[PDB]
Amino acid sequence: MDVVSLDKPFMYFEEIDNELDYEPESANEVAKKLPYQGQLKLLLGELFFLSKLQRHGILDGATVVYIGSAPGTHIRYLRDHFYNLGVIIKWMLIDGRHHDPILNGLRDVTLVTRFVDEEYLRSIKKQLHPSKIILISDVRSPSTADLLSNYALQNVMISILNPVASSLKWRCPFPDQWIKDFYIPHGNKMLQPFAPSYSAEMRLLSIYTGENMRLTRVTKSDAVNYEKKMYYLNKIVRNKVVVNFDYPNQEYDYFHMYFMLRTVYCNKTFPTTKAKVLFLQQSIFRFLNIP
Amino acid sequence: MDVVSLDKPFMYFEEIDNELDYEPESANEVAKKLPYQGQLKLLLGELFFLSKLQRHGILDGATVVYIGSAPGTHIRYLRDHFYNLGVIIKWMLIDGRHHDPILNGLRDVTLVTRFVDEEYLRSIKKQLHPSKIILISDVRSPSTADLLSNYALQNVMISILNPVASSLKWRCPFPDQWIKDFYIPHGNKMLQPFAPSYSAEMRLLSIYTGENMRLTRVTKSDAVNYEKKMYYLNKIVRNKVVVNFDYPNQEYDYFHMYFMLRTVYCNKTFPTTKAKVLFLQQSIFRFLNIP
């Protein structure tokens, strides 16, 4: 067995302290080990992101604009969680694809069947006015050409919507498929437990203070780094069994999930962080029909 | 006579401490009082900007890419000034219009007859590589539609060229001609002595540290402010005769010019700032054929 003792898991890209040469044969290995793993991946990251905003007092009263939301099964869990905590939020889920019917019939959630373009962003901005907007983006076109176009749309979402915070899908183009350098918004590169086995995807979390918008350039050298750091994390780290983690499941992803879940607010009072997390995890797995 | 005593002049937009309601009849008033006033306006601002970079030690060894440079008569003065000071710089002047022949025959200056587009910016970036670039932009299309397009090109100049510093033309669209909010690079809003009598134009000066790029949103309310602050400056301030300014010419613009010129480096040693400035001014006016 692949055992180890860890203090904490890597929460952000910058914390990864090692790298490995990407082995293309990794692409043929089992990408997922749990049913509905993708909904689980998104649920944890967005619960993490949103709980942070709650902590900073910027969630209550906001309209969450989620673009690239369908099917959005896991989003029903997020909505219930904050709704039950007393936080007042409106959800606007937009995708050209159809949403899970469990999202219908909630006055606080508006489903829109539309593929957004810059012009539409303008109309909804005029229509949301004057609410404070929190943007979540998971749009998907993939070539490096596709990625750049998605990233370009994500930056236009921020400039038109002008949100108070944002969570954006972020996967650096592969160095061997580099086209040109580009800019992404400045934010924390939140790592994702339960991401596919060798995925290099993370989420970019940002909070917008003032009327400024800070971007950061991404080059091929950065692309080389992303590949090696993420490859090291996926191949080595995520395959570890953290034996000094007293929890029903000690695999790295559960250890990593534990640290995100420990930041979530509940109505129920618990005697230990371990009890709250076990509760939230049980709750999350039951909702998603994960054994 | 319109007399007053002033400590210093307003160097940046933010310093303007008063405003006036824009009177449209001002548009019919004499816009210029000196021959070649436009070359003088550009010369002082760019001498100011470039001397600053020298002070920060980022000028020597740079390639100055000036887009919207023709005719560029005043640019010959700038080139000579730094060339004579021993600073090593290469100039690349690009405009679809033709440059003043006084700029020909200098190995350190390359004239390009081209209207730049994003693609061309890419090729020159590949060709300038690996020199450090200082961008100066004075491109001109004007409707608010024209402005936005120019500003959009200016931001693409920065993202493709990725300069160490930049000076950009900046005039906020008039509130009564507002189209949409937009972003401009963050920088100092340098005010311009000898600008047309009622011009609301200034120059945006920026220095790029790290791999980040900070932008700032401009709204109609900002547009209302620009109009009133600039109107107050043009109508009231610039019409002042600073009587406690011991200088051959006490009009506000000369007082303002004095503060920019006092920051310029010379080979000749002077006993007082007043002597250096008088020298630089005499020199500048003689070069431009201004009496």
Ligand SMILES: C[n+]1cn([C@@H]2O[C@H](COP(=O)(O)OP(=O)(O)O)[C@@H](O)[C@H]2O)c2nc(N)[nH]c(=O)c21
């Ligand atoms: C993690 N990774 C994956 N691939 C390629 O990406 C293809 C699709 O797998 P993926 O990258 O997991 O898809 P996604 O990121 O769109 O969700 C695989 O078949 C590999 O060829 C990769 N190709 C390169 N060059 N470098 C990498 O780090 C890398």
Ligand SMILES: C[n+]1cn([C@@H]2O[C@H](COP(=O)(O)OP(=O)(O)O)[C@@H](O)[C@H]2O)c2nc(N)[nH]c(=O)c21
């Ligand atoms: C300074 N100013 C000028 N204009 C208009 O701008 C026209 C051209 O004059 P300009 O603004 O000096 O041109 P420029 O900025 O392109 O160099 C004038 O005929 C006026 O109608 C202005 N119009 C408005 N609404 N507000 C202003 O502050 C203002």
Ligand SMILES: Nc1ncnc2c1ncn2[C@@H]1O[C@H](CSCC[C@H](N)C(=O)O)[C@@H](O)[C@H]1O
């Ligand atoms: N312009 C656009 N506007 C809206 N959705 C977009 C888009 N372009 C692509 N997408 C959507 O991006 C999605 C990527 S998959 C998203 C999964 C979803 N976030 C979840 O919670 O289940 C697809 O449903 C796709 O239709």
Ligand SMILES: Nc1ncnc2c1ncn2[C@@H]1O[C@H](CSCC[C@H](N)C(=O)O)[C@@H](O)[C@H]1O
């Ligand atoms: N795409 C582009 N590339 C180059 N020059 C441009 C441009 N679009 C407009 N311009 C130029 O912008 C200039 C504005 S007037 C500039 C005056 C000049 N800076 C001076 O020193 O004399 C015009 O010469 C015009 O041809």
